[PDB]
Amino acid sequence: QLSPTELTEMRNDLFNKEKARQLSLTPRTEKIEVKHVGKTDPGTVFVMNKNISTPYSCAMHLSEWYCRKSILALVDGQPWDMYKPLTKSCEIKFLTFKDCDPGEVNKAYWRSCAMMMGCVIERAFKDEYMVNLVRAPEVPVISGAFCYDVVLDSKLDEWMPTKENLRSFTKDAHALIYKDLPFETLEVEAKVALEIFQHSKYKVDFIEEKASQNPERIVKLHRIGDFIDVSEGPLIPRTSICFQYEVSAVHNLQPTQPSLIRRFQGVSLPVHLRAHFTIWDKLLERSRKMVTE
Amino acid sequence: AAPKNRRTIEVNRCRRRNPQKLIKVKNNIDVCPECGHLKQKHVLCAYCYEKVCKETAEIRRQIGKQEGGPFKAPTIETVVLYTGETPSEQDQGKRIIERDRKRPSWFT
Amino acid sequence: ISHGRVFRRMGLGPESRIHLLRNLLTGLVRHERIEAPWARVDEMRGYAEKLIDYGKLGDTNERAMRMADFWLTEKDLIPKLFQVLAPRYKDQTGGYTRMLQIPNRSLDRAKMAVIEYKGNCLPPLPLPRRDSHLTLLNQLLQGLRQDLRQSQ
Amino acid sequence: KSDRSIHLACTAGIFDAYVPPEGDARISERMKKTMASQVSIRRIKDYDANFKIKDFPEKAKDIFIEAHLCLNNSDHDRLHTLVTEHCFPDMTWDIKYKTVRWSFVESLEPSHVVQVRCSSMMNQGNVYGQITVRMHTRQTLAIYDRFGRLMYGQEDVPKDVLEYVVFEKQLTNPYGSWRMHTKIVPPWAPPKQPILKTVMIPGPQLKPEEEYEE
Amino acid sequence: ISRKWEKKNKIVYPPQLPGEPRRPAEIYHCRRQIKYSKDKMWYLAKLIRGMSIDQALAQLEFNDKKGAKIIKEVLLEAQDMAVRDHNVEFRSNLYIAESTSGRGQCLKRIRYHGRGRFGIMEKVYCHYFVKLVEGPPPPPEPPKTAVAHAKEYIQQLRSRTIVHTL
Ligand SMILES: [Mg+2]
Ligand SMILES: [Zn+2]
């Protein structure tokens, strides 16, 4: 058995090795052409570096308004990360929180906040006790609270958290938001993904189902600092795109045997869409209420 | 009442660089969704507004050409039609004003 | 002290104030959309609402006839007031005009305003649209509305 | 109407420019082109009968190398000595506030005289002689900012270049010499090295009344 | 007169060794003989010091002053010549490091008063100077905390000596 520290630096080392392998796969500078076809500043050609430049680099070329308001990238019609390297000549369009149909941005924010709360759990529960992380289910935004599934210890099968513990999780998440970490992305072969996540059966199952879903067995890995997680799509650029955060509730799922699954539910709202105190309190109550997928 | 003494540059720099005299930073500036130019969030966009104003000016030129002289305001409603549009059955007894351009997308 | 003084001190006096507002109201009836300094537009907005009320009162009324005769200095817009604008707003109660702030005059940096009669034939102004129903906060509150409707 | 006129020491153009042949770099009428070449040769030898076309290419390589070392050292007087006024500004203006680091590594194949043309007498009393020579060599390039940051090329690794350099000499000048006039790049030339920086080409900045038509 | 800002823009640096920080680009721009007062121009420049280029252009776009329009035109020219001439990668990646105003060359006119008395009008002109530096705007200096205040006080109390003895 490895210590949780040593597991963390093993995962970080293999992540950096894969990223450096992709960078060495693309050593020479090569110019692609990306056409901005948005409504604002229309028909603008950027000459990007292949597998180096990003939609955020497009935004730096345009203005700081694009940098500070562009959350998701529509590259050839599909959602793309702000910090993901661009691989081909394409057409780009920047997606903000306050568009006509921001639903993809909503899903990205939801998955990012769920990943942050998973990191909070994993580095919150004690060393004596065992923590396993199962999934981040695709919970629709209209439900009220994003969810993460955790297997806790058999010594804690009877333990329920208090309001002080839930506030501790919330303050850890706010510490992360203050730390302001970019959501690093990586398109990784399924074998190397299993090589990152050997010591987690549930993560192995998640990686296997994603490799079954796509043809080339390429999964999405994301990193905030030292924590690495598999995803169901693109994520927002930075943890500082979160302003109001709360880990509302912890619940036990119905089948206690063979293992106890605990759903951690939280709610959050970005800086661009922050709400008043009373509206936020009502959202806190609804997020504390149970969410079924 | 004349100054008894000359005021020094230290006095004058305190007076003239007091924060009450400095220009306040504005926080109500937003990017206009339609055109991408900067706008104040309680004020109309200058670019979109002068777009609407220039098209309104052309339409008013055509209106004045149709009236042809002062004191000739009609007693019926007015509708503007662009190139390639026929008057609707609801737009039956209404003064039609023709414009020699395609109907802009923001105009319905 | 000016507690409860609802009228601005415009022009060279009260009569000059009335003549300024009358010229602006005549321009608004003729062109159906004008722009001017913001305070003048506010005062003329109130007078424009009451003028449309008199137009709805109608041409056979001698009082409304005399009021339109005073307040329209072109004497051709009085048929326009009684036979176009009042038939247009025969359905509404009192929401006849729209007043929106336009940036600044470029000469003396005056706060500017555009005022229009609703309906119109002109191109529409870039009105401020509220945030769409599909954003994060609106979706969360829509879920809240559904949950409260289910609960009660 | 003053009788002093500008005494030009060069021309604006290439005299019957050598069209590059397709596949000259890919592979590792002739009599008419050759006869015109020797016609210009006998004109050049009539104006100065100590010229050898066999001896030219080494002087051409020396002129090329020393001119590019003039770019290295910003030695504008010697660069004027070896380079015509038609070639000075499009060789110096884009360097003026940059540092260029150029070197000559080797030559792959010996340089070859590929065309010789000459002017008429009518050009204000002056007769020009132009010779185009094929160069195929190996060189390095590293161009820096005003601030000493690299913008183009790489330091030590050399790369292959092919160029068709046109030289001109004012033969009627008693103190004339052979200087670099222009160089033909082919229309079929391979694309150059990509730049190290990122470029945004703006779209049409539209007036308000204008609408954007794709 | 003096015109040293335009030459500051043309100072050239030796090439960098591959192990040094990148040395961000500096661009010096100025406008001379602006029919405006250098004091009001000081107010506008002091507003735009330390800002990012887009934040500066927003504040200038919605200020109400003649000098604000003039400074905005100067900043647009500086950004254009930055990414046209001095190898700046991203045109949004510039901040205003220096921004100040100076006296221009003025003219004297007579101002008539009552009786037979007169005053000297000054038709005032000014200059505007801006230095743009590549990179994000530097963070503002955070306020001094009670921890810093107490630490400095205890530093002084430990710095005390015995005056006028051995
Ligand atoms: Mg007054
Ligand atoms: Zn706009």
Instruction: Name residue D132's beta-bridge partners.
Output: D115, D166
Which ligand is in closest contact with the Cα of B30?
A: 2
3 state SS for chain E: CCCCHHHHCCCCCCCCCCCCCCCCCEEEEEEEEECCCHHHHHHHHHHCCCCEHHHHHHHHHCCCCHHHHHHHHHHHHHHHHHHHHCCCCCCCCEEEEEEEEEECCCEEEEEECCCCCEEEEEECCEEEEEEEEECCCCCCCCCCCHHHHHHHHHHHHHHCCCCCCC
CA neighbor of D203 nearest in space, from A46, E74, B104: A46
Residues A61, A223: Cα–Cα separation, whole Å: 26
Do the beta carbons of residue A182 and residue A238 sit within 8 Å? yes
Residues 6+ apart with CB under 8 A from A199: A2, A7
**In terms of CA atoms, which chain C residue is nearest residue A270?**
C136
CA neighbor of D83 nearest in space, from D157, D165, D196: D165
Q: Is A267 on the interface with C (CB under 8 A)?
A: yes
Between strands E126-134 and E94-103, the pairing is antiparallel
Q: Is B33 on the interface with A (CB under 8 A)?
A: yes
CA neighbor of A242 nearest in space, from A266, A209, A214, A221: A266
Residues A267, A279: Cα–Cα separation, whole Å: 12
CA neighbor of D21 nearest in space, from D199, D189, D212: D189
Residue A161, burial from CB neighbour count under 10 angstroms (0-12, 13-18, 19+): middle
Residues A142, C144: Cα–Cα separation, whole Å: 8
Residue A267, burial from CB neighbour count under 10 angstroms (0-12, 13-18, 19+): buried
> What tokens does D27 get?
């592979």
> What tokens does D107 get?
């030559």
* Chain centroid offset of residue E23 CA: 20
Residue with tokens 């500017």: C112
Residues D142, D102: Cα–Cα separation, whole Å: 6
Do the beta carbons of residue A22 and residue A30 sit within 8 Å? no
Residue with tokens 């308004």: A65
Residues D16, C10: Cα–Cα separation, whole Å: 81
Residues 6+ apart with CB under 8 A from E81: E27, E29
Range C50-88 burial, b when 16+ CB lie within 10 A, else e:
ebbbbbbbeeeeeebbebbeebbeeeebbebbbbbbbeb
- Alpha-carbon Rg for chain A, nearest whole angstrom, is 20
How far, in Å, is the centroid of ligand 1 from the Cα of C70? 24
Of B17, B22, B25, the CB nearest to E59: B25
How far, in Å, is the centroid of ligand 2 from the Cα of B32? 5
Residues 6+ apart with CB under 8 A from D66: D78, D82
Q: In what order do the strands lie in the sheet with A31-36?
A: A78-80, A72-75, A90-95, A31-36, A44-49, D199-201
Residue with tokens 């030292």: A226
* Chain centroid offset of residue D98 CA: 20
| H or E element at residue D59 | helix D56-73
CA neighbor of E49 nearest in space, from E109, E108, E17, E96: E96
Across the interface, whether the CB atoms of D97 and E10 are under 8 A apart is answered yes
Residues 6+ apart with CB under 8 A from C84: B74, B75, B76, B77
For residue A69, how many other CB atoms are within 10 A of its CB? 17
Angle at A221 (CA atoms; ends A220, A222), nearest 5 degrees: 125
Between strands B95-98 and B78-81, the pairing is parallel
Residues D85, A170: Cα–Cα separation, whole Å: 73
Residue with tokens 């604002």: A40
Whether the ω angle into residue A258 lies within 30 degrees of 0, i.e. cis, is yes
Return the partners of chain C (3 or more C-beta pairs < 8 Å).
A, B
Residues of chain D that touch chain B, judged by Cβ-Cβ distance less than 8 Å = 208-209, 211
Residues C84, B75: Cα–Cα separation, whole Å: 6
Amino acid in position E153: Y
Which CATH number, 3.90.470.10, 1.10.10.10, 3.40.50.1970, 3.40.50.80, labels domain E1-166?
A: 3.90.470.10
Residue with tokens 């009008």: E121
Q: DSSP letters along chain B, please?
A: ---SSPPPHHHHHHHHHSTTTSPPPP--EEE-TTT--EEETTS--HHHHHHHHHHHHHHHHHHHHHH-SSS---SS-EEEE-TT-PPPSTTSSSEEEE-SSPPPTT--
Please tell me the distance in Å from A98's CA to the nearest CA on chain B. Answer: 9
Backbone angles phi, psi at D206, to 5 degrees: -100, 135
> What tokens does D179 get?
């200087």
Report the domain count for chain D.
1
| H or E element at residue A74 | strand A72-75
Residues C144, C136: Cα–Cα separation, whole Å: 12
CA neighbor of D196 nearest in space, from A47, A63, A44, A86: A47
Residue with tokens 């063979």: A258
On whether residue D206 sits in a domain, the answer given is no
Give contacts of A99 with chain C, Cβ < 8 Å.
132
Distances (CA, A) of A5 to A12, A16, A123, A150, A196: 11, 17, 10, 19, 14
Which ligand is in closest contact with the Cα of C17?
A: 1
Residues 6+ apart with CB under 8 A from E74: E29, E30, E31, E128, E130
Across the interface, whether the CB atoms of E46 and B16 are under 8 A apart is answered no
Instruction: Name residue A250's beta-bridge partners.
Output: A264
For residue C30, how many other CB atoms are within 10 A of its CB? 15
| H or E element at residue A245 | strand A244-252
**In terms of CA atoms, which chain D residue is nearest residue E15?**
D148
Residue of D147, D154, D157, D198 to mutate for E, most E C-beta atoms under 10 A? D147
Residues D108, E143: Cα–Cα separation, whole Å: 66
- What is the crossing angle of helices A163-179 and A103-122, to 10°? 110
Across the interface, whether the CB atoms of E62 and B38 are under 8 A apart is answered yes
Binding residue positions of B for Zn(2+): 32, 35, 45, 48
C12: helix, coil or strand? coil
Residues D67, D167: Cα–Cα separation, whole Å: 13
Give contacts of B103 with chain D, Cβ < 8 Å.
none
Which method was it determined by?
cryo-EM
Give contacts of C126 with chain B, Cβ < 8 Å.
34, 44-45, 48-49, 52, 106
> What tokens does B59 get?
């339409």
Portion 178-197 of D in contact with E at CB < 8 A: 197
> What tokens does C107 get?
């000469």
On whether residue D92 sits in a domain, the answer given is yes
Angle at A105 (CA atoms; ends A133, A109), nearest 5 degrees: 35
How far, in Å, is the centroid of ligand 2 from the Cα of D176? 64
For residue A53, how many other CB atoms are within 10 A of its CB? 20
Do the beta carbons of residue A218 and residue A190 sit within 8 Å? yes
**Sign of torsion, CA B78 B81 B87 B88?**
negative
CA neighbor of D131 nearest in space, from D168, D164, D163, D162: D168
Across the interface, whether the CB atoms of C135 and A144 are under 8 A apart is answered no
Residue E32, burial from CB neighbour count under 10 angstroms (0-12, 13-18, 19+): middle
How far, in Å, is the centroid of ligand 2 from the Cα of E73? 20
Residues D46, A38: Cα–Cα separation, whole Å: 68
Q: Is E33 on the interface with A (CB under 8 A)?
A: no
Across the interface, whether the CB atoms of D208 and B105 are under 8 A apart is answered no
3 state SS for D19-42: CCCCCCCCCCCHHHHHHHHHHHHH
> What tokens does B104 get?
């802009």
Do the beta carbons of residue A230 and residue A202 sit within 8 Å? no
Q: DSSP letters along A97-133, please?
A: TTSS--HHHHHHHHHHHHHHHHHHHHTTS-SSS--EE
Q: After which residues does chain E become discontinuous at a C–N distance over 2.5 Å? A: none
Q: Hey, which bits of chain D come out as E strands?
A: 99-118, 128-144, 150-170, 179-184, 199-201
Residues D138, D135: Cα–Cα separation, whole Å: 10
Please tell me the distance in Å from C10's CA to the nearest CA on chain A. Answer: 41
Distances (CA, A) of C150 to A145, A280, A287, C143: 18, 21, 16, 11
User: Can you give the residue range of the structural domain that contains D49?
Assistant: 1-184
User: Can you give the residue range of the structural domain that contains C65?
Assistant: 10-120
Residue B52, burial from CB neighbour count under 10 angstroms (0-12, 13-18, 19+): buried
Residues E80, E84: Cα–Cα separation, whole Å: 6
Distances (CA, A) of E110 to B84, E118, E119: 65, 7, 6
Amino acid in position E10: K
> What tokens does B76 get?
């019926």
Residues D70, D65: Cα–Cα separation, whole Å: 9
| H or E element at residue C50 | helix C38-57
Do the beta carbons of residue A136 and residue A118 sit within 8 Å? yes
Across the interface, whether the CB atoms of B40 and C103 are under 8 A apart is answered yes
Q: Is B34 on the interface with A (CB under 8 A)?
A: yes
Q: Is A275 on the interface with C (CB under 8 A)?
A: yes
**Cβ contact A–B (≥3 pairs, < 8 Å):** yes
Residue of E9, E10, E12, E27 to mutate for D, most D C-beta atoms under 10 A? E12
For residue D67, how many other CB atoms are within 10 A of its CB? 21
Q: How many cross-chain Cβ pairs, D to E, lie less than 8 Å apart?
A: 43
Residues 6+ apart with CB under 8 A from A267: A144, A145, A146, A245, A246, A248, A283, A284, A286, A287, C140
Angle at D56 (CA atoms; ends D50, D60), nearest 5 degrees: 135
Give contacts of E47 with chain B, Cβ < 8 Å.
22-23, 25
Portion 135-174 of A in contact with E at CB < 8 A: none
Range D130-156 burial, b when 16+ CB lie within 10 A, else e:
bbbbbbbbebbbbbbbbbbbbebbeee
Do the beta carbons of residue E70 and residue E78 sit within 8 Å? no
> What tokens does C89 get?
């707003």
Report the domain count for chain C.
1
Do the beta carbons of residue A22 and residue A51 sit within 8 Å? yes
Residues 6+ apart with CB under 8 A from E96: E48, E49, E50, E51, E53, E56, E75, E130, E131, E132
Across the interface, whether the CB atoms of D209 and B55 are under 8 A apart is answered yes
Residues A253, A258: Cα–Cα separation, whole Å: 12
Residues C78, C85: Cα–Cα separation, whole Å: 10
Q: In what order do the strands lie in the sheet with E126-134?
A: E26-34, E126-134, E94-103
Across the interface, whether the CB atoms of E62 and B16 are under 8 A apart is answered no
DSSP conformation class of D97: T
For residue A183, how many other CB atoms are within 10 A of its CB? 24
Amino acid in position D176: G
**Cβ contact D–C (≥3 pairs, < 8 Å):** no
Amino acid in position D173: N
Q: How many residues does chain C have?
A: 152
Residues 6+ apart with CB under 8 A from C46: none
CA neighbor of A125 nearest in space, from A149, A150, A148: A150
Residues E82, E76: Cα–Cα separation, whole Å: 10
**In terms of CA atoms, which chain D residue is nearest residue A60?**
D200
**CATH code for position D122:** 3.10.450.240
On whether residue C149 sits in a domain, the answer given is no
Residues A227, A116: Cα–Cα separation, whole Å: 9
Residue of D149, D152, D157, D199 to mutate for E, most E C-beta atoms under 10 A? D149
* Chain centroid offset of residue B67 CA: 25
Do the beta carbons of residue A87 and residue A51 sit within 8 Å? yes
Please tell me the distance in Å from B86's CA to the nearest CA on chain E. Answer: 43
| H or E element at residue C146 | helix C136-151
Q: How many cross-chain Cβ pairs, B to D, lie less than 8 Å apart?
A: 10
Q: In what order do the strands lie in the sheet with A218-224?
A: A184-189, A218-224, A227-230
Do the beta carbons of residue B35 and residue A40 sit within 8 Å? yes
> What tokens does D29 get?
């009428």
> What tokens does A238 get?
């930075």
